Structure 1
C-alpha cells in the first residue's frame, strides 16, 4: 500500500489544500461526498462501502477558515475531526503560534496523525503545506515539525513552504516570522520547496494573460505542481520517481534541501492550440528564468541537481534529446561536481483540468524541482529585511511579551547567516 499524509497549516496551507483536494478528487473520480461512481490509496482511504475519506489534517488557529470548509461544498467529504480548528489566531506573531496558543492545538492534531498513520500500512512522508509569512504557519509549522521529528523522525518531510515575497508583502512583521522559522526549516525538514507570490503573479502575466487573478488561481497552479510531485505514486509510469527518489538525487548535502518549482506549460485556451507543445519545447520554457515559482533568477546562480517530472504522452527518447539541448545551452550553468543532474521521470497519466479553471487541455507537462545556489539570495534579501527592523528592536515587545527570550532573534539570524555561507562554499 502506497500512501502519504498531507498536513495543511495556516491560511495559505488550508487554501492551497482546497485546490489540492479539489484536483485530487477530480483525478481519482471521487465525488464531493466521497462516493466515487487502487490509484486512490495515496490520498484517500476506503471507509464504508464507497466513502473515500481524504488523508489530511486541516489545522489553523482561527475558526474562520476551517469552519467555512465545514460549511462548504466539501463538508461531508473530509472526516470532520480531521479539521482541527483553533480558537484564536497567532496574530502574525511567531511567539503566539509556538508557545502560548499552539501548545494546546498540536496535541489534538497529532492525535489525528496517530490515527491516520495507524489506518495505513507503508507510510512514506508528510506533505506539509504552510505559509512562513506570519503566525500559525510558522509557529505551528515549527512545533509540528519538531515533535513529528521525534516520534516519526525516520520518514521524509516534503514541506511546500510559502516564503515571503521580495517586493510586495501583506505584513510588516513578516520578516520576523521567517527568520524565526529557518530554525526549524533547516533541520526538521527533509525537502523545503520555496514558493513565492509575484512568481505566480507574473507567470499569470506572461503565460495565462489574466490581468486580475486571485489567490484561488495561485492555489490551482500550486495544486497542479503537487499532483506532478506525487504522480508516480498513485499512477503508473515508465520512469517512476517515488518520494525517496525526489531526495536521493536532489539533496547533495544534508543542509542543502531548499529547491524551487517550475511547471510548464501554464497555458490558456488561446495559446494551447496555437503551439505544438511537445517534450522539447516544454522543458525549454521550464528552464526559462522567469518560470521559477520563486522570483529567483537562476542566471546569477548556478544549478547543482535538477529533477524533471514529464507527465502525459512523453516518450523517453524525447526526454533525452531535450535534456541534451538544455545541457548544451550556455546560460544554463551546472556545477563541476555533477556531470549528471537530470533526474527524469515519466507519468503515463495526462494532467487533468479543473472545469472552469484557468488551464487548457494539454497532453504533456513538466514539473521541475531544481536545486541551485541561487536560493541563497532569497534568504539574503530576508536577512536584509531582518536587520533594519532589529536595528532598534522594532515589534519585539509582542515576541518577548508572549514567552520568547530576546536572544532567539540573534540565534536565528546567525543560523540563517550560516546558511548563505554554506550556499557560497558549496559552489567554489
Structure 2
C-alpha cells in the first residue's frame, strides 16, 4: 500500500539517488547492476516493480541534459528502466530561471506522463521522494517546478525532499544564492518535509568518521545514501508497528511552514567488515545527537528542539532505549508546548554492515543559521545586482526575487520567535 515513487532531478540528484538505489539492492538481495534476483527479503514492493525475476526501482529520472540515458547505462547498468528516463535538449547553466521558466513545455509534460505511469502501477501512493541540489540549474528550477506540479496534481500526498544546500564557508558559483533562495521558497510552499544537507558537514564526517583518506563526492554520497536507506528501513522491513512517510510528517511538523529537518546517522560503515562491534544503543544515541554526525552546517546541541524522531535498527534492547533516551532528554533543550518531545520507533532488521544502527531526524531551531547565511549572501549581491541580468532576462521580475526572499525570511522569523518565546513558556 505505502508505495514510494522517487523523483531524481539533475546531476547531483541522480548521483545521490543512484547510491541509494544500489544500497537498497544490497539489503533486499537484488543485483545492483541488473535488477535480477532469485531470493529476496523484506517488502520489496514498496520501492520496486517486480516483473518476472527483475526488480525495477520506481523512479523518475529527470534532466535537461542531452544524453542522460547513456550517462546512466555507463554507471548503473540496467538497473533503471529507460522508459522512465527523461532526457533534455540543451540544459540549464546554473540558472534557476532556465530550469524553472525556459525548460520547454514538452520536457515537463513527459516528466508528468512518467510520474502518472509510476503512480498508476500502485494500489496506493505512500508518498514521493525528491532528490536534488539547490545551487544547480535543473535540480533547483526544474525540480522546483516539478514539486509545484506534483503537489497540484496530488495534494494530500507527503512529499519529502532531500537536498543539498550551499556549504557554510566556501561557495561554488556567484549565482548560487539566487538559485538557493528561489529553490528554498518553493520548498517552503510545496514540500511536506525537507531534509537539509550540505557538503561541508558531510566532508568533515567523511574525513573523521569514515576510514577513507582524501574522500571524493563518490564517498560523500555514501553518507547521504546511508541517511536515505536508514530512514526507509521500517517501510522496507515492515513490522507490526512501523513508520511511513505520513507518520513522519504528522509527528515532526507542528506548523505547515516549519518542516525543515536535520538528519544524523551512526555508525557509518563502508562495505566490508571494517566496523567494530560496539553493540551499544546508548553509545549510538549519544553519537547521533552529538554535533559530529550532523549532515548540515549547524550545531544542534546549542539550539532547541520542537520535535525529533529516532529510529533504531537491529537487536536493540528496550531497556537501553529507555535509558538512552532519558539521557538525551536531560542533556538537550526542548520547547515546552510540545510536551512529549519525541517519536520513537524500532525495526529489528540490521543494516547490512552493522548489527545495530540509529537514524535521527528533527526540528532544531538552529537550522535558521543555514538559511540566514544564504539570505545575507543574496542580499549583498541583490543590492548590487551582480549576475542579476541572468535571472530577469530569463523571465523573472525583481518582484519574484524579492518575494522569494521575503518568504524565506518569514520562515526564519517564525523559527526564531518561537525559540526565544520558549524560554518563558516554562514559567
- Normalization by structure 1: what TM-score? 0.93
Kindly indicate which of the two structures has a greater share of residues assigned to helix. 2
Aligned equivalents of 1:276, 1:299: Cα separation in 2: 24
Contact 2:35 2:56 (C-alpha < 8 Å) held by counterparts: yes
Aligned equivalents of 1:400, 1:309: Cα separation in 2: 45
Residue 58 of structure 1: SS of its match in structure 2? strand
**Count of residues in Structure 1 that have an aligned counterpart in Structure 2:** 415
1:41 aligns with 2:33: no
Aligned equivalents of 2:27, 2:375: Cα separation in 1: 41
Quote how far apart the aligned CAs of 1:247 are: 1.2
Quote how far apart the aligned CAs of 1:161 are: 1.2
Q: Deviations over 1:283-320 (max 9, x none)?
A: 10111113210110113321111100111111222211
Contact 2:266 2:359 (C-alpha < 8 Å) held by counterparts: yes
Residue 399 of structure 1: SS of its match in structure 2? helix
Q: Deviations over 1:262-293 (max 9, x none)?
A: 001125679732x6241000010111113210
Contact 1:102 1:140 (C-alpha < 8 Å) held by counterparts: no
Residues 218-229 of structure 1 aligned to structure 2 (within 5 Å): 218-229=220-231
Residues 49-60 of structure 1 aligned to structure 2 (within 5 Å): 49-60=52-63
1:134 aligns with 2:126: no
Contact 2:63 2:86 (C-alpha < 8 Å) held by counterparts: yes
Aligned equivalents of 2:289, 2:329: Cα separation in 1: 11
Residues 107-186 of structure 1 aligned to structure 2 (within 5 Å): 107-186=109-188
- What stretches of structure 1 of length at least 5 have no aligned partner? 353-360
Quote how far apart the aligned CAs of 1:203 are: 0.8
Quote how far apart the aligned CAs of 1:10 are: 1.2
Aligned equivalents of 1:319, 1:117: Cα separation in 2: 37
1:318 to 316, 320, 323: 320
Aligned equivalents of 2:139, 2:24: Cα separation in 1: 23
Contact 2:9 2:131 (C-alpha < 8 Å) held by counterparts: yes
Aligned equivalents of 1:236, 1:13: Cα separation in 2: 27
Q: Which residue of 1 aligns with 2:424?
A: none
1:200 to 199, 202, 206: 202
Q: Could you say if the C-alpha distance between residues 272 and 29 of structure 1 is closer, same or farther in structure 2, counting changes exceeding 3 Å?
A: closer
Aligned equivalents of 1:300, 1:311: Cα separation in 2: 27
Q: Which residue of 2 aligns with 1:357?
A: none
Residues 168-317 of structure 1 aligned to structure 2 (within 5 Å): 168-237=170-239, 239-267=241-269, 272-273=275-276, 276-317=278-319
Residue 132 of structure 2: SS of its match in structure 1? strand
Aligned equivalents of 1:293, 1:212: Cα separation in 2: 18
Aligned equivalents of 2:152, 2:278: Cα separation in 1: 50
Q: Which residue of 1 aligns with 2:5?
A: 5
Aligned equivalents of 2:37, 2:273: Cα separation in 1: 33
Quote how far apart the aligned CAs of 1:239 are: 4.2
Q: Deviations over 1:369-414 (max 9, x none)?
A: 1111111111001111101111111111111111112221111111
- What stretches of structure 2 of length at least 5 have no aligned partner? 422-427
Contact 1:36 1:50 (C-alpha < 8 Å) held by counterparts: yes
Quote how far apart the aligned CAs of 1:102 are: 4.8
Aligned equivalents of 1:205, 1:239: Cα separation in 2: 36
Quote how far apart the aligned CAs of 1:234 are: 1.6
In angstroms, what is the RMSD of aligned CA positions? 1.7
1:404 aligns with 2:396: yes
Contact 1:203 1:266 (C-alpha < 8 Å) held by counterparts: no
2:87 to 85, 104, 108: 85
Aligned equivalents of 1:15, 1:213: Cα separation in 2: 16
Aligned equivalents of 1:364, 1:313: Cα separation in 2: 7
